[PDB]
Amino acid sequence: QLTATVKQNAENARQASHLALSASETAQRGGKVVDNVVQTMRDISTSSQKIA
Amino acid sequence: QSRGIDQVGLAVAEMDRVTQQNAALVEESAAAAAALEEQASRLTEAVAVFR
């Protein structure tokens, strides 16, 4: 019975790592997109300043 | 696993106690068996006078 739970615990660990690792990739990609939006606000703010 | 090992922990502890009890019976039977060897000699000694 313990050996059976070891596979389940070990399986959920690897399966959770795949989702956790994949959840980190989408998070890092989202951060880069957020960084691009940060520069956009500076462009809009800078562009709006020129209009003023 | 936590609750499962608890069942094995008590089992190992249970077998450990029974292992000590078995050893006592082995030594008890060994000591009792050795006594028969001494008492067995008394049977021949009681009749050793008669050649």
UniProtKB/Swiss-Prot annotation, chain B:
The chain holds residues 466 to 516 of 551 of the full protein. Receptor for the attractant L-serine and related amino acids. Is also responsible for chemotaxis away from a wide range of repellents, including leucine, indole, and weak acids. Chemotactic-signal transducers respond to changes in the concentration of attractants and repellents in the environment, transduce a signal from the outside to the inside of the cell, and facilitate sensory adaptation through the variation of the level of methylation. Attractants increase the level of methylation while repellents decrease the level of methylation, the methyl groups are added by the methyltransferase CheR and removed by the methylesterase CheB. It comes from Escherichia coli (strain K12). The modification Glutamate methyl ester (Glu) is found at residues 28, 37. It is found in: Cell inner membrane. Belongs to the methyl-accepting chemotaxis (MCP) protein family. This is Methyl-accepting chemotaxis protein I.
